[PDB]
């Protein structure tokens, strides 16, 4: 009786009344494998386009935006900000030196004469701003590679961090190609490394120069930031 239910019987019964086929389509509502485990380190560039990152100390998983509970409960629209153009956002919030203080603090603390090389790359600020927007207060760190181009290590303060889909989209799409984006964790916490794509690609420029150096006026370094930045620089040197 129930046996012998060929596909033909199914499609015939539906052809009788399309509403039964709609009922069937309605019941098949759950995707099979939304969540995909991922292990560190991970090159974010070489990543599928729409995916959230649910990084946590015990495990590190990657899920899809459509079925990301945290990205769904919160206002899915959230706050669409105009960060679309790298250069636009650079010259938009270089004025906000009262915020973004940690970024300027780290580059200044290094004062290697490569503060010029940090200013030369506007991509850096873009990363910081967006990582600050969607993923809370960041702790910037700047290191010197054999290449004149400085490498950046933005550290994120979090036991379990939820990197949203829109953030990864912005980063990979607007800055991705020009600078290698990667994620790894130092002792205290996870971090996003912004790097130059070897020496194959150098792009964009501007030179405010001393205009910004007179501006920084060597603002005070909070001892909390002082300890964090010092320890993280030491630990980077150990890597």
């Amino acid at each position: 009786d129930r046996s012998h239910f060929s596909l033909r019987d199914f499609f015939r019964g539906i052809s009788a009344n399309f509403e039964l086929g709609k009922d069937f389509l309605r019941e098949m509502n759950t995707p099979i494998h939304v969540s995909e485990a991922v292990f560190l380190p991970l090159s974010l560039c070489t990543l599928s386009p729409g995916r959230c990152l649910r990084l946590s100390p015990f495990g590190h998983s990657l899920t899809l935006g459509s079925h990301c509970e945290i990205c769904i409960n919160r206002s899915q629209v959230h706050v669409p900000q105009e960060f679309s153009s790298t250069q636009l956002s650079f010259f938009n919030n270089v004025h906000k030196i009262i915020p973004n203080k940690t970024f300027y603090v780290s580059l200044l603390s290094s004062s290697p004469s490569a503060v010029k090389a940090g200013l030369s790359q506007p991509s850096l600020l873009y990363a910081y701003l967006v990582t600050g927007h969607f993923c809370g207060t960041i702790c910037p760190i700047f290191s010197t590679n054999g290449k004149g181009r400085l490498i950046m290590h933005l550290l994120l303060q979090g036991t379990s961090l939820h990197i949203p889909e829109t953030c990864l989209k912005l980063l990979c799409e607007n800055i991705g190609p020009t600078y290698e984006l990667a994620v790894d964790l130092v002792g205290d916490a996870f971090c996003i490394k912004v790097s130059p794509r070897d020496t194959v690609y150098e792009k964009a420029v501007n030179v405010d120069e001393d205009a910004i150096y007179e501006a920084i006026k060597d603002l005070e370094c909070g001892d909390e930031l002082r300890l964090q930045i010092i320890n993280y620089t030491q630990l980077i040197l150990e890597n």
């Binding site: 039964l20 709609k22 389509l25």
Partner: protein, 194 residues
């Protein structure tokens, strides 16, 4: 009337309009040409525009079309062609494999995968047994049949990149799905065969 061909074409278009996308306005361009049936066809039964975020029940529609065609003693099996023309992504439903072959015709006939980047002037070609090949390594043997595991295509269309995300849907309430299947079996048993 020309019901032998016209009526069949109309029914197929109605199927695609009714079951492809569960909700929303479906931008479909129907074809009014007998060349649909002629071998080596370059013209589709229907061309459907693809919108970001919407879910398109591809496999159900495909298997339903194949059933209707085999009922009408049409030998060939359908073929779906999802392509990026630069302006929009289009799903074209050809009843038989077109003439645009693998031999340097446009951007390669990209195969199925979880995520497929679909650049401009590139195509994806879905055939008769591609769905089962795609579902084989993702579900257990009992689940391979469409009655339990359905393939669908979501569109991730952004101005900076367009990507096709192929997914596999199952029923959560297996008991309720069984009840719906019972309804369908009752309807089939009541209707008369040849």
């Amino acid at each position: 009337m020309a019901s032998p061909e016209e009526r069949l074409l109309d029914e197929l278009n109605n199927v695609i309009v009714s079951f492809l996308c569960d909700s929303g306005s479906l931008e479909v361009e129907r074809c009014s040409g007998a060349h649909v049936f002629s071998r080596g066809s370059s013209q589709p039964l229907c061309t459907v525009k693809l919108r970001h975020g919407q879910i398109y029940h591809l496999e159900f529609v495909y298997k339903f079309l194949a059933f209707k065609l085999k009922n009408c003693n049409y030998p060939s099996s359908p073929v779906f062609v999802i392509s990026n023309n630069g302006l929009a992504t289009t799903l074209r439903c050809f009843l038989h494999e077109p003439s645009g072959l693998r031999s340097g015709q446009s951007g390669p006939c990209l195969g199925l995968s979880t995520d497929v980047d679909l650049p401009k002037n590139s195509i994806i070609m879905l055939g008769q047994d591609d769905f089962i090949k795609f579902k084989s390594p993702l579900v257990f043997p009992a689940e391979l049949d469409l009655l339990k595991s359905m393939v669908v295509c979501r569109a991730y269309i952004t101005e900076h990149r367009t990507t096709m995300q192929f997914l596999v849907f199952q029923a959560a309430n297996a008991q309720k799905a069984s009840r719906v299947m019972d309804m369908i079996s009752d309807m089939s048993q009541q209707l008369s065969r040849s």
